[PDB]
């Protein structure tokens, strides 16, 4: 799932998101499939808080543009003590992810939905002096959105839904730049095999953006036992804006070159500075999901779900400055599928148990996968439980645990000329687990 995150509540996490938001009176419908809101008979307010623990590691090699094993370079440029390098260490993280849903039926035909969601999120921080520093150091992306939706009941077996999401994305990327290595491979300054890791500066890009998105859905209940749903979330145009700066620890090599205007001579059309304003498109991919919930009896309900994400829109990551390209990195993500199956079982009038599993394809591919987002296909295994209060005017608590088994993937990353011409040869191992807890208030 690259850097897209499931936008559900604890109950959803408990069943690996199977059935989407089609289970009875699930406030998450306010965003996931607004149409299902037409079948929620009362006011519901819900808050979810997840903690995601992600483990990321690299095992392998890295080479400079001349085929030499990468080294740790120098403390502060030629003449200073040589530094050692490393495997990057643990690049994973632990993060909190809140989610809120509110559903308010208006008429016997209309319902209103409000929600706070986190559509996008990823993070990887490799030790600054690791062997793959020419490809990545830090990567941080998070998208939080506020939503408003409306549902319209056409029949007692069909309804439609539509909504708008106001999204805010913040992004950060840091990566080592080796000007001498870039020059050696340039169309204007090549010829001399400058040694690698003599010049070095940390490139840092910080950008943000707020823009609107639209989504819609439809629900069809053929047999009171079966609830089918189709939801579509359109791609969200998202041009991130901010700045970039280079933190040189070169003994003055990098700044001397830049102030000397040598970069533009190496790569005509390039206007690199020690710092400047910047932009980078990072559209939130469109996706569609088909959900089906079948109630076998008064205690067992199962759900199946298939989501097609149009990750193909993420063709490249291009850093621009004043409308001009600084560097364009191809990623050519592939469209993806995510299948889930799971369900709920009411043990008593108070207790309910959940479980589920899902298969989620990674949009990354071998030719372009790098250390920023080194994921692979994942298998999701979830367990959940819910408790409705005895002496309460309707307050339910839910818990969930979810483990994500990610397959070990290869990294064969090659850097283009202006990025130093180096390459990686290894594999990333990742692991993920989520703890979820929510409180649902059925005030009505």
Ligand X SMILES: CCCCCCCCOCCOCCOCCOCCO
In the list 22, 30, 196, 207, the residue contacting ligand X (rule: CB under 6 A) is 207
Residue 119 β-bridge partners: none
CB closer to ligand X, 197 vs 301: 197
Beta carbon nearer to ligand X, 121 or 410: 121
Ranges within 107-126 binding ligand X (CB under 6 A): 121-123
Nearer to ligand X, 4 or 40 (CB): 4
218 is a site residue for ligand X (CB under 6 A):
no
**Within 353-392, which residues bind ligand X (CB under 6 A)?**
364, 369-370, 372-375, 378
Find the binder of ligand X among 38, 144, 284, 327 (CB under 6 A): 327
Mask for 158-187, x = binds ligand X (CB under 6 A): ------x-x----x-x-x-x-xx-xx--x-
34 vs 105 by CB, closer to ligand X = 34
CB of 179 to ligand X, least distance (A): 4
Residue placing its CB nearer to ligand X in the complex, 102 or 173:
173
Residues in binding contact with ligand X, number by CB under 6 A: 62
Query: Which residues 254-283 are close enough to bind ligand X by CB under 6 A?
Result: 256-257, 260, 262-263, 266-267, 272, 280, 282
Report in angstroms how near the CB of residue 184 gets to ligand X at its nearest: 9
Centre a 10 Å sphere on the Cβ of residue 155 and count the other Cβ atoms it contains: 9
Which spans of this chain sit near ligand X (rule: CB under 6 A)? 5, 52, 54, 56, 95, 97, 121-123, 139, 141-142, 164, 166, 171, 173, 175, 177, 179-180, 182-183, 186, 189, 199, 203, 205, 207, 210-212, 240, 253, 256-257, 260, 262-263, 266-267, 272, 280, 282, 317, 319, 326-327, 331, 364, 369-370, 372-375, 378, 404, 406, 418, 430, 432, 434
């Amino acid at each position: 799932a690259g850097f897209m995150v499931p936008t559900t509540n604890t109950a959803g996490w408990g069943r690996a998101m199977a059935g989407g938001s089609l289970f009875p009176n699930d406030p998450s419908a306010a965003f996931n499939n607004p149409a299902a809101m037409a079948f929620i008979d009362k006011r519901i307010a819900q808050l979810t808080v997840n903690y995601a623990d992600i483990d990321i590691k690299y095992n392998g090699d890295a080479y400079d543009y001349q085929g030499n094993p990468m080294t740790g370079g120098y403390q502060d440029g030629p003449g200073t003590p040589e530094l050692g390098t490393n495997d990057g260490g643990q690049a994973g993280f632990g993060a909190w992810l809140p989610t809120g849903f509110l559903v308010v039926p208006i008429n016997d035909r209309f319902a209103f939905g409000l929600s706070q969601v986190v559509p996008m999120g990823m993070r990887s921080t490799w030790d600054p002096n690791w062997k793959g520093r020419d490809f990545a150091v830090d990567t941080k992306i998070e998208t939080i959105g506020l939503t408003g939706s409306l549902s319209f009941k056409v029949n007692d077996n069909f309804s439609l839904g539509a909504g708008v999401i106001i999204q805010r994305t913040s992004g950060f990327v840091s990566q080592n730049l080796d000007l001498y290595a870039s020059a050696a491979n340039s169309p204007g300054m090549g010829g001399i095999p400058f040694p690698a890791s003599n010049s070095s500066a940390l490139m840092r890009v910080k950008v943000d953006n707020t823009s609107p998105g639209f989504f819609a859905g439809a629900v069809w209940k053929p047999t009171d036992r079966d609830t089918l749903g189709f939801a579509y979330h359109a791609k969200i145009r998202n041009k991130l804006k901010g700045h970039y700066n280079l933190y040189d620890h070169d003994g003055g090599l990098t700044e001397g070159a830049i102030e000397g205007g040598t970069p533009g001579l190496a790569y005509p059309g390039l206007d690199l500075r020690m710092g400047a304003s910047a932009s980078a498109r990072l559209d939130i991919p469109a996706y569609a999901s088909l959900d089906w919930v079948h109630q076998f009896n008064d205690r067992l309900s199962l759900g199946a779900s298939a989501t097609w994400t149009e990750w193909s829109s993420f063709q490249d990551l291009t850093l621009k400055s004043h409308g001009n390209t600084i560097v364009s990195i191809p990623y050519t993500y592939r469209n993806t599928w995510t299948l889930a199956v799971g369900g709920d079982y009411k043990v008593t009038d108070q207790w309910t148990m959940r479980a589920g599993v899902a298969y989620d394809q990674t949009p990354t591919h071998n030719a372009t996968r790098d250390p920023r987002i080194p994921d692979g296909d994942r298998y999701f295994a979830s367990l959940g439980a819910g408790y409705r209060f005895q002496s309460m005017p309707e307050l339910s608590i839910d818990a969930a645990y979810s483990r994500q088994f990610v397959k070990e993937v290869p990294l064969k990353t090659v850097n283009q000329d202006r990025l130093g011409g180096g390459r990686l040869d290894g594999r990333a191992t990742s692991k993920g687990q989520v703890f979820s807890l929510s409180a649902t208030y059925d005030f009505h």
